[PDB]
């Protein structure tokens, strides 16, 4: 029954140097998001979580640890999608049993699945788990484009709540809000939060909210209250930080900014580069001084 | 001199059945924009004016008729860009002698020009004419993407005013406003006016403003005033109309909507389809009844 | 150190309705390829094997069955790549222990891995197993493009043998053969076999060879012998069959063509469509009559 | 009725420093192609001729000069396509009056014309001139893709002889040859001449033939004779040269290679870079020493 509107951090995961999960570090990341970034929720097992590089057992362990640490303090969404639909169903049942408030699932990728195959994949996860479902749309990684009529076909299933929209088409975004006004949209591009919020999205899911969740909430709330001059000021500073993060290496730089606040956010998981070079550590420290001190 | 902020219709041109310019009809389009749509200005010779399908002599005739009809009641911007730099210089001189308030020029297209070639093109037109210049960026037609640092190089020429930004990258849009706060941005996607206006663009240039200019100004002014809930209601209705216009054939349907108000907006120019089928005439009359009566 | 040149079928896998592997049917597919299609080898665990939709245990089982059935009568290459490098290493070690003649790995996908990350991926699989490696390049699924210099960086590891080139850039193909004449290339687009063979590729790996292996060998051998007129006639017939297969649904139609020859090639694995409609079964029977009877 | 099969240089044009046509230089380029490169024909007014940067009067001047110089010694094809259909008709009339053996036209670009619009553009040019037509397809500059069925619809007009195929899709190329065996295909990618000739194209139109026409003919004739091994050697040397030419700047490097053989090939036309830098001149001399004796 939890309210799923608002600000969700896409949870990063602390890894050890061999790619195993650092449980102590992961708990610190969850606590930091709840207590310091003051998020409304966590989106667990998404792209940001380095999810698609992991085994099924590692994904389950992440779901277990996040929920045990968070308890019922905040809303939790579990991304369980994959090219492997039988894995998605297994993970979806697990996360449902642990009490995740909704599931979410990336459009299946690699192969060029037809729309009917995509709709069957969502319907299958829903039927096996009995849980709510949020479509996770990220066309710049998957190459999958879903149009207005196709969203409506997905929404014929009453357990589909809406879409986590990590997409840059704001005409599509407005058309979704017009066609399906009771369905939810979470914006997925942190550097375009202000314009997405201007179109009445219901929340946002972001990797950078792990370190910049305070400003993110401001942008969102001020935009929806009509305080655009102030919201734009804060989006400008946010995007100076994001531009730095992206140039330096997104996941590693957010983890370095966490480490600089005492959170043991650990290594990245190979095949991503597992650690920053010394010059890039220095650069991350300059970002910390300029934007998060 | 003139203030160049606000609502600019991308001027449609009335053609006869043989592709020649219908002067009476083109004057009627100009008068309708000034007197009924209440635009701040016209952008003449743009994609919307079917410009790239015409001869240099036809382009000159359009510039002459628009300026003669409008006189100084509104601001006028002349788009003079081409793959042919010598033509762009000739049209830029001609429009400047007519008293156009600024020039503008599409990034040169077809050949894959390098950035230094593109910059030389802008500087050459400016030096030859002595007039102001607005960069016209339309990557979805030209395939040219100009980054933040590159716009900065263009803006080293002090006669460059800004960019007519017919592009959907709202991260780039924000970054341009951060880096070059005194340079102007005009939004070019009518269906995304609200989110562009929320990022503080200075104006908008739009084909649909030839018939929907009243709503277009409302969206823009309400957004500027932080009245987002009301602006969004009007963007929604505007986008029902635009969706229908796009589906039925953009330029011909805008022309039909003008003809239904007694403006003799004429044929389209081949190789675009020159007239609407009977069924598409009926569809345009249904749009008129639903959205513009 | 088996000869890896010549004709390899990309092994299809027989599935039951519940998505499990039908072992009897998979053994039949292996036997048909060896005994009737007269392949030089099999490429096991590739895109064609529906590999990316499967669990680690399932991939292991396919490797075990293929090797138990084929023994040492043909060459076997094990595709073990994934977004999960730890799984790739686990499957690489497993296929090495089973006695596969080389490993192969798709470029890691979904995330936008840098080139250094891609090379570290190949090196980590090789150094953890000590086996040979064939780069599997399929830009139209992964969006990864590797240039000539980057191939040379990969080839600095002496256990990299060459590339399974499921790509359409015949300029790149020629430059690779020029730059690395001792390294091997297997053509991956069955419908462009003749032109790839004319540039001196060493072999080909193809899904359609599971049913069209007789013609495929003819095209390859006739081209190498300079008998282009005769090779072209056979490529034209092959491409009539391939055009029909693609239109009807690639994997399901190859499987139906196998079933029509008494091979229990089974269902496809969800989220792919698992079975042909009645109309498409009839269309496949027509292809069988026209091209394979 | 002239035979249009074989080797066609895409004629470069000699410009003065101010962008005007250097007639003396252009005649020398024509004579070099006929007398030294021993071409079958010239393709005049194409991409290579810097055509799309020029005025109608300049395009006419080039057609007049090329014909006056070539007389009846070789075949001549006039590319007259443009976004401006009226201009294309005017040029096609003029080239027809001058005696060009066929017209050719690029698919209309910039705007996103529909297929019925593209077909009408070709039929309009043909029906206003009464001359033959070659479709000029170059998706990498225009973004226009035409499929096999669509070619068939173009070929419904009996004056359409076939297609100048500057495209990399060798499956499409095969399928066109199969579907329309009496219609001609000229390859437009000089660096893929061998694999195109392997599929039975009737000729080739190329920018590099202005300087490498001897090897180009050898690759083409040896491939049609099944002498693949020798053809492939010469394609390798050819592509070493082409790689250097592309790296150094295509149009300017071909012109410099002409100048090094005593042909006054002139400047390029702005907005292309008009002259090679001293360092790039030196690189061109190294290419000359290495590949063009």
From Swiss-Prot, chains A, B, C, D:
Keywords: Carbohydrate metabolism, Cytoplasm, Lyase, Schiff base. The keyword Iron-sulfur does not apply. Its EC number is 4.1.3.3. It is found in: Cytoplasm. GO terms for molecular function: N-acetylneuraminate lyase activity. Although equilibrium favors sialic acid cleavage, this enzyme could be used for high-yield chemoenzymatic synthesis of structurally diverse sialic acids in the presence of excess pyruvate. Engineering these enzymes to synthesize structurally modified natural sialic acids and their non-natural derivatives holds promise in creating novel therapeutic agents. HAMAP family: N_acetylneuram_lyase (MF_01237). This is N-acetylneuraminate lyase. It comes from Pasteurella multocida (strain Pm70).
């Amino acid at each position: 029954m939890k309210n799923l509107k608002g600000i969700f951090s896409a949870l990063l995961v602390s890894f050890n140097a061999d790619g195993s999960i650092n449980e102590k570090g992961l708990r610190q990341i969850v606590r930091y998001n709840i207590d310091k970034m003051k998020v409304d929720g966590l989106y667990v097992g998404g792209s940001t979580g380095e999810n698609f590089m992991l085994s099924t057992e590692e994904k389950k362990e992440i779901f277990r640890i996040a929920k045990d640490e968070a308890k019922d303090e905040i809303a939790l969404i579990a991304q369980v999608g994959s090219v492997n639909l039988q894995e998605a169903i297994e993970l979806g049942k697990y996360a449902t049993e642990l009490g995740y408030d909704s599931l979410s699932a990336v459009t299946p990728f690699y192969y060029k699945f037809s729309f009917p195959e995509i709709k069957h994949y969502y319907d299958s996860i829903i039927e096996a788990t009995g849980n709510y479902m949020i479509v996770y749309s990220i066309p710049f990684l998957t190459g999958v484009n879903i149009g207005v009529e196709q969203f409506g076909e997905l929404y014929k299933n009453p357990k589909v709540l809406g879409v986590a929209f990590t997409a840059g088409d704001f005409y599509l975004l407005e058309r979704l809000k017009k066609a399906y006004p009771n369905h939810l949209i979470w914006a997925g591009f942190d550097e375009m939060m202000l314009p997405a919020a201007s179109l009445g999205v219901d929340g946002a899911i972001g990797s950078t909210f792990n370190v910049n969740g305070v400003r993110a909430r401001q942008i969102f709330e001020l935009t929806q209250a009509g305080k655009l001059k102030e919201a734009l000021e804060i989006q400008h500073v946010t995007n100076d930080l994001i531009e730095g993060i992206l140039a330096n290496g997104l996941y590693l730089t957010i983890k370095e900014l966490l480490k600089l606040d005492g959170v043991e956010a650990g290594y990245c998981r190979e095949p991503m580069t597992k650690e920053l070079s010394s010059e890039k550590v220095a650069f991350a420290k300059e970002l910390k001084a300029k934007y998060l001190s």
